[PDB]
UniProtKB/TrEMBL annotation, chain C:
Keyword terms: Hydrolase
Primary enzyme class: hydrolase
Domain of life from the UniProt record: Bacteria
Domain Carboxylesterase type B: 4-485
EC number: 3.1.1.-
InterPro entries referenced in this protein's UniProt entry, alphabetically: AB_hydrolase_fold (IPR029058), CarbesteraseB (IPR002018), Carboxylesterase_B_AS (IPR019826), Carboxylesterase_B_CS (IPR019819), Cholinesterase (IPR000997), Type-B_Carboxylest/Lipase (IPR050309)
Membership in a protein family: Belongs to the type-B carboxylesterase/lipase family.
Catalytic residues as annotated in Swiss-Prot or TrEMBL: S193 (acyl-ester intermediate), E309 (charge relay system), H406 (charge relay system)
Protein name as annotated: Carboxylic ester hydrolase
GO MF annotation, one: cholinesterase activity
Length: 494, 496, 493, 498
């Protein structure tokens, strides 16, 4: 274990190396968004004299508890501060020009951090000879409060501050990744859930253009979470009322403690109230609209979902294990609205078991599968190289009710199955290591060559409209063609 | 002399004690207390704590009825009890090192017992074998195994196996934290007796437990022991709720009821095995022996066995089994075996000595214990797993030798706890028991360490197979007998 | 490296262990002497919930930078804060009841810390199966300003606060050292220079009467640095005027920044103005007087000096190399006053080389050898077991002018020759490792058995008035009897 | 293909450069700048710095006069110079590892030279031998070797040997920090040429340097080379002070004088070797050869040697060596060997070929170089230290071959710097030079590595002993010659001058 010192444009940073892999933690990519910089676009960090310590993770953005995953896991509450704009880098050596993988974590734009141990980049760096960056972006009100109507044009883009932080992190990578052994021209961005929604937004955002050449969207897309300017303004008003800040009062906005913003967001109620906004500046149009027009004709995309995405939410709501029909229909109607009737009839026929079990694929399709396929189809029509996957390995935890649930693929992709708390999520079956390797190397290959094919996997055709080939990650990996044919038709017919 | 040893789990620091030779941590929490809203819910990791937690005292036992069958022979002091019972105990030579781990699941018919019972003390095993021993508590009785799916709906999915989910959770804790106590998480052996061995049989079947252990020992129990169908469990669940005074669907009364009232509600059902693991479709997808035959545990290595005269212990509860011929003795048999008892009673009647009830005790032993043992042994042999089989023949002289090699006698031999309080009271004071105890003790140590129970004290112990059906017999002179239940095997096959 | 958690009476502390040795750094043995507690005796530290981090050294006492050794060896500047009352522990295992060695660092009561790497206790712990404690005490004005006359009886004992800090640490040791594998009844205190002067004061101080069983005094004694209440009050007056704090102004005394005390002390000009005071409370009598009364008849003592103690001060002043006679007479005249004339010619005649070279043993005797011999003679008369040593290994650095200078023996005793900067002081000759081992194990044996004898050394008789046997630590160690016989008479005559 | 490498010394972080194969750090400070109050004082460790200090450029050389003969032979321009000169340079394959270390002390008559000379570039040694190479600067001329003890008193004790104390300081820095650069501090070899080898000879004698190195290479130099008695140095010091305009005891003028003026004051003394290490009693307690004979360096292993025609280089300064006059030649011989000049002139006049002066050049070569070499080699053999001896016979064709195997010719061969700027002007363009260079290059590497200079390229090289007096001869065909100076050894012994 030894220190390794690297010099960024802002100053020197002190990391650590075991010889095989070096890691720098808590590197500032922007000036702290506190005081006047709170609710403002990110600013470059002030240069420093001396050797800055990069052996410790920076604090996470201020967040609510969100223990769903953390209760099954043993994970501790994350150390938090409004001063959170930090990234962490894993590289084999500062010498070289490797492909770069930049990770955008999920958590519904409200929770999470780049510091989470499941996102540790050591294995990717060691196995793939690549540089891995994980980062923090402003979450919650500090990140995504649309204050344009309330506080005027001084706060333009406030609905997308979290995305502007991600872009600032991408700009830092282009300018300084060379000092850490990375090639700024070979950058892949990848994320899960809200992280994949952020990737979907970044494909549409004009400021992010040229900062990345390839993108991976895991259980999320541009269809997931983006809000219209009108809807975002209404959410902002409700939060301000919970916050006690009247529109136009600059002081009260800055004077409010960061925790109070988190409490006000939580008091609005469950769901995804805050997300990226189609404001016209940062996000000029809907991400799906930009995709259809060929905004990402040059970008290569790997997009996918897990087989039983929505099953994870059966932990906070056990009705999905039941056959009660009033509660199930109410839950379905919340997402699909007027189409609830026919689709419930379609999904009830297929499968076996309780009604909730048969209705869970409906929710997965509405939330996750739909955005994935639209992303893949739009890219295919404009001719960009695209690959599609489905993650089918199931965790046996809690009686096997989760199946291949939301977020299960994270430890497989990062090969962090042994990291703290992961096996509580995935279970301890020895077969999981081989599945992780198949997925891990595919992510490596895509980042390096733009093609996820490697010798472990069978022949993985590019996703196209005629075949709709989709790689299935299982104990025995296989390629399935048009696996969502039936549902995709009925959703069109309903 | 005794000095403190402070070790840090993922959740916090715990303070144990060491005499220099062995360290012990008692009352280490592996889950949040299953109280209030957490009652009737699966275990969750415990809240992390700052500071140093005391691990010098045992945690409270799960709320349970009194068992003075076992207590009258033993000192049997009433166990301190609380619904907040999810605790485990660790015995290790040193926090430094990476030894094999032995995890004990205590018996007691899914209603009683605790990891804190002194016959389960792991000091001798750790000292002799250089292993880490963990004893644990799981939720017992209604709080553990009430099947509330039909009554209260899908919020209580898996409620029939909450005790099993606690055992899984304890193993997850061991995998997570046993390194800090000197254990190797990749070399974990699970062993249990009676309902504990029945729990082991379920763990071989349960997919959530897969990978949490590499070897298993089943003493006087199997996967067949106490398992219920969902239907059978819901009917018992209905009976329990009525005695408790809880109407179906009344969630407040469910949580409001004191834990003692649940224990009494189970007791009001009458004697027997009313609660056990349930084939609910989730936690346990199929019957354990069905999973065994399908190769669910083909990777796991197993040491399985029974005592010679298992059921004789339960004859203390009912005189009829020692008494002369009765219609009731046939009824007691038919309740376990239904139609087949007609033919079985006549075959057992001719065999053996003494009263008809005494001659019928081997019938009950085979039905309850020997059958599942041989089925478990046959299943692993067919799927290719390494299996060894044993029979415990040492006889206790108490009560005139009616007990013989009865149920639960082999435990202090396995743990080398013969001088624990009251043990010689159960086993007798013959000086030969020390050699038999060492014989079983070292074989258990050997199986946990190397995966093969053969050691120099014992004669050559052949692996159990379908051809030879080799069974090591633990006696004053240990010997290997081949197909010792051959005669009975055919007759049981001949009728149901 | 893995964490080891121990519970003190005040709370838990988290240390580090390589398997062979555990170390805890920055353990607070007293409440921070800040604010109202400044210029006051130490108080027990506040208990804490949780596990306190003991992986990093606590800050050192506020001190001026003294680059005598540090310029030669390259040492960096100590991190400093007024809250400095911390100690550091090295033990094989928290299980056990080993002898305890408590180190009091030198630095003329003005500089130093227990955290200096030459004081690392790992080697002592590993080799000797002992627990080693190094500590910080309040230095400078915060430690030894005699403000009783200035600020009245509220500030009784202010002249000896640094000594009270050492006592509190020894009291802490008695209470808590059992948790770290030490036996509080087998405690040896050892120090060098001002640290050995503190040991000399501790033998006299009645509060310390039970806190230790044995003492080692390296190049220092109770004769070294102790001040009368009268003279200390006069030193206090000069500092207060440099400070700008008028006597009887409590706010100014607490208002002044801690650094200003260091600057005011340094502005008092060259040499050391602060030391322990015979105030009547903490120190009732002169340390040498107490020894003569048999106050330490119970304690076993190991006392010694280096052969060329004063040669170190030559690095600051070139005249010692020089043959100028007016300058040397004046410097000698500063120490010995009216007896300078006769002594100068006794020393001028003996030896060879420059006049400065011939006059350096004169200064060595006055400052160091005198207090050592008086301490040994007092203990011998009262019957306490006492051993005497002389360190003769010479450093070849800077043309060999230093010889066996002051403080050279520190890395030898601690077996810390490879530690950062030590080799610049001692040189890199391969012979030093054996001399260190001989000294190191002898210190171990004394702490363990009360006898410094070990197989490496020749037969080492206890120091007595008849034979006056002194063990000489050299490449070939030997016993010399009455080696200062000639000097003893001339200084007496 | 060139990237930054940041390594941390005890004093701070330094940024070098790497092509992948070898990393280089230039201009790393090993002592506080010896300016102002630190002038005429021993070296002190450098002040710690925060941040990353640039180590991509060479530090300035010690203030020195111009060396015209070296300049005429070699293209390099006058060196950048400053009184703040205490810098060293490191070449290593990688900061990871624990390689043997070679520390180079440059020659130049204690007045000129720097570690930055491109012929001293350690890249080739690092890549081929898997070793770490350090070149350093030490104070030269008056700033380095003025014996000020008598003039200004004991404040300047050891001032006659400040350059040597700088060399010790660099070795202390190596012991301290070389681990961060991929070197092993316990396997350190010191090597030098000319006055650099004279410094090595003194370092064997100096007790302060003991243990800082385990092996030494002495090329065209020995402990006898340039060392002065305290008396002679005080006399030279007075002349230097007079030219400088500094009266004894005037501390103001001593510190006030510009560093260039010191260089001029030494130059005003005239040609020769006016300044060298001084037997002052402290830094150097005894004469280096006296310490050697008593076994002061019995633990150190030594490779010592000379070039075949050492003194011939200096004939490009003074043409009398090409002339035939007896009066001029006799004066020059008398300066070195004194009263024994007549016996040797007659010995040497018969021997050899050419003019009398050309035949008298071996006399000077033996007195200045060969004699001290054999005395050093003989001393180590007697005390039992392992010693190997060499003679460099490769000849330069420049100036009609009058130079032959002259002084300093072997340097680019040992460093394998035949390709660096200007070298071909000195050595010539014969394709054979590469093989002889490899023979020496690899032999030096082996000695630093294993303590034995034997490698497969060279024939079997026996250890030097008093009986056989085995000497490795570096030629186009490398060979071993036994007692090659036997004839001269006996005559010089008879002569009372050896």
């Amino acid at each position: 274990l030894h220190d390794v010192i690297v010099e960024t444009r802002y100053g020197a940073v002190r990391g650590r190396s075991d010889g095989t892999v070096c890691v720098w933690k808590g590197v500032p990519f922007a000036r702290p968004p506190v005081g006047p910089l709170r609710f403002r676009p990110p600013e470059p960090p002030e240069p420093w004299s001396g050797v800055r310590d990069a052996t410790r993770f920076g604090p996470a953005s201020v967040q609510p508890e969100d223990r769903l995953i953390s209760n099954l896991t043993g994970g501790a509450t994350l150390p938090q501060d409004e001063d959170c704009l930090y990234l962490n880098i894993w590289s084999p050596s500062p010498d070289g020009r490797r492909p770069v993988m930049v990770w955008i974590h999920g958590g519904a734009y409200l929770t999470g951090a780049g510091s989470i141990p499941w996102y540790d980049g050591t294995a990717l760096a060691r196995e793939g000879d690549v540089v891995v960056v994980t980062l923090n972006y402003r979450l919650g009100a500090l990140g995504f409060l649309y204050l344009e109507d309330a506080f005027g044009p001084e706060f333009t883009g406030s609905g997308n501050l979290g995305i502007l932080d991600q872009i600032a992190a991408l700009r830092w990578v282009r300018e300084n990744i060379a000092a850490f052994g990375g090639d700024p021209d070979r950058v892949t961005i990848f994320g899960e859930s809200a992280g994949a929604g952020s990737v979907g937004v970044l494909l549409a955002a004009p400021a992010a253009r040229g900062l990345f050449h390839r993108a991976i969207l895991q259980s999320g897309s541009g269809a997931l979470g983006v809000r219209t300017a009108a809807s975002a303004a209404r959410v902002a008003a409700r939060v301000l009322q919970h916050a006690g800040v009247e529109p136009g009062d600059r002081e009260a906005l800055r004077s409010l403690p960061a925790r109070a913003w988190a409490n006000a967001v939580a008091a609005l109620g469950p769901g995804l109230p805050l997300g990226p906004v189609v404001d016209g500046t940062v996000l000029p149009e809907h991400p799906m609209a930009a995709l259809a027009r060929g905004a990402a004709r040059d970008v290569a995309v790997l997009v996918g979902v897990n087989k039983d995405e929505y099953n994870l939410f059966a932990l906070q709501d056990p009705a999905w294990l039941g056959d009660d029909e009033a509660a199930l229909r109410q839950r379905v109607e919340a997402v699909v609205g007027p189409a609830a009737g026919r689709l419930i009839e379609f999904y009830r026929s297929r499968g076996e078991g309780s009604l909730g079990r048969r209705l869970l694929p409906l929710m997965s399709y509405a939330v996750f599968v739909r955005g994935m396929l639209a992303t893949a189809d739009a890219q295919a029509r404009v001719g960009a190289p695209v690959w599609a996957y489905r993650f089918d390995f199931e965790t046996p935890v809690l009686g096997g009710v989760l199946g291949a649930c939301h977020a299960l693929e994270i430890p497989f992709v990062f090969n962090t199955l042994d990291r703290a708390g992961a096996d509580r999520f995935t279970g301890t079956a020895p077969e999981r290591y081989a599945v992780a390797q198949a997925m891990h190397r595919a992510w490596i290959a895509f980042a390096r060559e733009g093609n996820p094919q490697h010798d472990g996997l069978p022949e993985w055709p590019r996703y196209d409209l005629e075949e709709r080939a989709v790689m299935v990650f299982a104990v025995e990996p296989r390629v399935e063609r048009d696996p969502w044919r039936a549902e995709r038709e009925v959703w069109a017919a309903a």
